[PDB]
Amino acid sequence: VGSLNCIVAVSQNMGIGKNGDLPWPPLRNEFRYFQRMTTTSSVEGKQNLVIMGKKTWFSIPEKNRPLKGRINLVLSRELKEPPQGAHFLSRSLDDALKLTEQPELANKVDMVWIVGGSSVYKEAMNHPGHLKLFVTRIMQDFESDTFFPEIDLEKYKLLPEYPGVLSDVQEEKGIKYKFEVYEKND
Numbered sequence: 573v574g575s576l577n578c579i580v581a582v583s584q585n586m587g588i589g590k591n592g593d594l595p596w597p598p599l600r601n602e603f604r605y606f607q608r609m610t611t612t613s614s615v616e617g618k619q620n621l622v623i624m625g626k627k628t629w630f631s632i633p634e635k636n637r638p639l640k641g642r643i644n645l646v647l648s649r650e651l652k653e654p655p656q657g658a659h660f661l662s663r664s665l666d667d668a669l670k671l672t673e674q675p676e677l678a679n680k681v682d683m684v685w686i687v688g689g690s691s692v693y694k695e696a697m698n699h700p701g702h703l704k705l706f707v708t709r710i711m712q713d714f715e716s717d718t719f720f721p722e723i724d725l726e727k728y729k730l731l732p733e734y735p736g737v738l739s740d741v742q743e744e745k746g747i748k749y750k751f752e753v754y755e756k757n758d
């Protein structure tokens with residue numbers, strides 16, 4: 573198994589969701605960035621693993637589930653088995669990450685990407701060791717009912733460059749946004 577990473581898009585007021593979807597209208601190139609980051613694996617013969625809560629799973633359009641080219645894992649303590657289309661089910665983040673070490677996955681998984689929601693982002697952000705956050709800053713306020721936890725900048729350093737991530741301001745549908753990469757090690 574390789575690196576541990578979170579990825580999120582967040583408004584200025586720290587919103588990530590409203591009513592089971594995103595706070596903003598569809599930003600097609602932003603979605604494509606999510607796809608490219610989470611799918612792209614530098615290691616031959618491996619895929620990346622995506623870890624998500626149950627509501628996040630059901631917020632992805634059924635036509636796009638499972639996220640293609642990635643191993644899809646859902647966190648739930650109420651489900652008895654993975655939802656239709658998903659590959660794995662875990663009862664805790666610690667369990668999911670230990671599973672990547674088991675014989676069924678140990679040599680299949682390159683990067684791990686945590687794709688939300690709010691509880692798993694908060695727990696991940698405080699997981700030991702080396703972790704990166706790929707954050708899209710949506711530069712407007714949007715009504716939301718689900719929020720991103722606080723990024724502790726004493727530990728998470730905003731990187732001044734990263735290969736493959738555009739540095740300039742993007743704009744779709746009249747909404748400006750920018751890509752950021754943070755890293756901690758503790």
Ligand SMILES: NC(=O)C1=CN([C@@H]2O[C@H](COP(=O)(O)OP(=O)(O)OC[C@H]3O[C@@H](n4cnc5c(N)ncnc54)[C@H](OP(=O)(O)O)[C@@H]3O)[C@@H](O)[C@H]2O)C=CC1
Pocket residue numbers: 579580581582587588589590591592593594624625626627628629631647648649650651662663664665687688689690691692695718
């Ligand atoms: N802007 C963006 O980047 C993102 C936006 N979103 C949005 O956020 C909303 C969904 O997020 P949110 O409401 O936070 O919900 P989650 O996706 O976190 O789903 C919560 C459910 O997942 C299970 N769960 C969560 N964490 C764990 C855990 N560590 N171990 C075991 N089970 C866990 C629980 O299910 P159970 O009760 O079955 O145990 C819990 O009720 C939607 O609006 C979605 O569109 C989501 C991700 C990213």
Ligand SMILES: Cc1sc2nc(N)[nH]c(=O)c2c1Sc1ccc(C(=O)N[C@@H](CCC(=O)O)C(=O)O)cc1
Pocket residue numbers: 579580581594600602603604605606607628631632633636639640687688707708
């Ligand atoms: C669950 C997360 S993490 C995240 N991080 C960033 N930067 N942007 C987001 O919008 C999301 C979301 S919400 C989301 C909902 C649907 C999809 C989706 O349907 N993705 C498909 C299709 C992508 C595409 O149509 O461009 C894919 O990754 O293959 C992706 C993310």
